[PDB]
Amino acid sequence: NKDMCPICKTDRYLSPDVKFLVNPECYHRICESCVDRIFSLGPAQCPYKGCDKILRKNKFKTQIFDDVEVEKEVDIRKRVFNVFNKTIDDFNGDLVEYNKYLEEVEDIIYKLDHGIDVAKTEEKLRTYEEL
């Protein structure tokens, strides 16, 4: 729920301590009190039902956008753009090849977002970041 945190079942009204502690691995409405209870002992699975990905407490952050899909798209864009940082001067002013590079990086960002070709694009990213 946008107002209530189902892991502790606390409304924002009578329990104002709930916050937007999101996970880069799997974005969820877990509050800080639930984070400090479950994951202070160590890493565990996702407390939400229907999801069991292993997550760490130190990787937690706050969401800056209202939409979860936009937030994960922007975070994937950050995770790709860190090594993919070719500019116009990197292409020596080649405008067309810069557009092709931008299309390629947007396509691999889209593929990482929707997971249609996650393995091959992840291998391509891992080979590119070594260079």
Residues that bind another protein (CB under 8 A): 8-11, 13-15, 33, 37, 41-43, 56, 64-67, 69-70, 73-74, 77-78, 81
CB of 128 to another protein, least distance (A): 18
Question: Considering the rule CB under 5 A, would residue 4 count as an interface residue with Zn ion?
Answer: no
Sequence-ordered list of residues with C-beta below 8 angstroms from that of 38, at least 6 positions apart, any chain: 7, 44, 47
Q: For Zn ion, which is the closer residue by CB, 75 or 108?
A: 75
Q: 95-114 and 68-81 helices cross at what angle (nearest 10)?
A: 130
Question: Considering the rule CB under 5 A, would residue 21 count as an interface residue with Zn ion?
Answer: no
Sequence-ordered list of residues with C-beta below 8 angstroms from that of 64, at least 6 positions apart, any chain: 71, 74
Which of the stretches 32-40, 76-84, 93-101, 103-111 binds Zn ion when contact is defined by CB under 5 A? 32-40
Q: For Zn ion, which is the closer residue by CB, 49 or 131?
A: 49
Identify which of 104, 113, 102, 36 has the alpha carbon closest to the alpha carbon of residue 69.
113
